[PDB]
Design a protein around this motif. Structure first.
Motif, PDB file in Angstrom:
ATOM      1  N   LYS A  15      -4.309  19.288  48.653  1.00 44.69           N
ATOM      2  CA  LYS A  15      -5.696  19.181  49.093  1.00 44.69           C
ATOM      3  C   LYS A  15      -6.674  19.755  48.075  1.00 44.69           C
ATOM      4  CE  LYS A  15      -8.126  17.551  52.362  1.00 44.69           C
ATOM      5  NZ  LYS A  15      -8.181  16.063  52.434  1.00 44.69           N
ATOM      6  N   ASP A  16      -6.270  20.772  47.312  1.00 46.84           N
ATOM      7  CA  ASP A  16      -7.174  21.398  46.353  1.00 46.84           C
ATOM      8  C   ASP A  16      -6.992  20.894  44.925  1.00 46.84           C
ATOM      9  OD1 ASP A  16      -4.833  22.671  45.447  1.00 46.84           O
ATOM     10  OD2 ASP A  16      -5.886  24.573  45.104  1.00 46.84           O
ATOM     11  N   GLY A  17      -5.999  20.043  44.673  1.00 48.59           N
ATOM     12  CA  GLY A  17      -5.830  19.446  43.361  1.00 48.59           C
ATOM     13  C   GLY A  17      -5.249  20.339  42.287  1.00 48.59           C
ATOM     14  N   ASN A  18      -4.560  21.418  42.653  1.00 48.11           N
ATOM     15  CA  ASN A  18      -4.026  22.344  41.664  1.00 48.11           C
ATOM     16  C   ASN A  18      -2.590  22.028  41.255  1.00 48.11           C
ATOM     17  OD1 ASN A  18      -2.458  23.377  43.877  1.00 48.11           O
ATOM     18  ND2 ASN A  18      -2.478  25.411  42.906  1.00 48.11           N
ATOM     19  N   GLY A  19      -1.998  20.961  41.792  1.00 45.33           N
ATOM     20  CA  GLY A  19      -0.668  20.538  41.404  1.00 45.33           C
ATOM     21  C   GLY A  19       0.454  21.024  42.295  1.00 45.33           C
ATOM     22  N   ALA A  24      -0.372  25.929  53.779  1.00 46.06           N
ATOM     23  CA  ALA A  24      -1.698  25.859  54.384  1.00 46.06           C
ATOM     24  C   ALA A  24      -2.315  24.480  54.192  1.00 46.06           C
ATOM     25  CB  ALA A  24      -2.601  26.944  53.794  1.00 46.06           C
ATOM     26  N   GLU A  25      -2.227  23.943  52.972  1.00 42.06           N
ATOM     27  CA  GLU A  25      -2.743  22.603  52.717  1.00 42.06           C
ATOM     28  C   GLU A  25      -2.033  21.570  53.579  1.00 42.06           C
ATOM     29  OE1 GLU A  25      -1.939  22.856  48.460  1.00 42.06           O
ATOM     30  OE2 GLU A  25      -4.062  22.442  48.072  1.00 42.06           O
ATOM     31  N   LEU A  26      -0.703  21.664  53.683  1.00 42.16           N
ATOM     32  CA  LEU A  26       0.046  20.693  54.475  1.00 42.16           C
ATOM     33  C   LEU A  26      -0.339  20.768  55.945  1.00 42.16           C
ATOM     34  CD1 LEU A  26       2.014  18.452  54.358  1.00 42.16           C
ATOM     35  CD2 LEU A  26       3.908  20.068  54.552  1.00 42.16           C
TER      36      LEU A  26
HETATM   37 CA    CA Z   1      -2.709  22.782  46.183  1.00 43.92          CA
END
Ligand code: CA
Ligand code: ADP
Ligand code: CA
Length: 69
Positions: A15-19, A24-26
């Motif tokens: 979700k945040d694009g950091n790879g 939490a994102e899931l």
């Molecule tokens: Ca991420």
């Protein structure tokens, strides 16, 4: 083709694009996508793909999970 589709699939959950897909994102993505999964199930999906044990799913672990028969 399928490689690009896998990349977009990964970007759905990172979700945040950091790879890295974090728990939490899931959880946020599943709740935002109308999927019925308990928090323990989300943590288990993360654990199953986490080959290196850092608690997150990078792009290559995600690829392995999608391309494994
Ligand atoms: Ca991420
Ligand atoms: N801080 C960073 N330094 C280097 N590479 C990064 C960094 N954050 C993310 N990446 C890489 O860039 C990819 C995201 O690229 P891109 O889609 O252009 O980013 P965004 O989702 O922020 O638009 C990630 O999958 C990861 O491989
Ligand atoms: Ca990992």
């Amino acid at each position: 083709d399928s490689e690009e589709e896998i990349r977009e699939a990964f970007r759905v959950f990172d979700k945040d694009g950091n790879g890295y897909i974090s728990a939490a994102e899931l959880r946020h993505v599943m709740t935002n996508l109308g999927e019925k999964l308990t928090d323990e199930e989300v943590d288990e999906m993360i654990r199953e793909a986490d080959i290196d044990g850092d608690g997150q799913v990078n792009y290559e672990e995600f690829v392995q999970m999608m391309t494994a028969k």
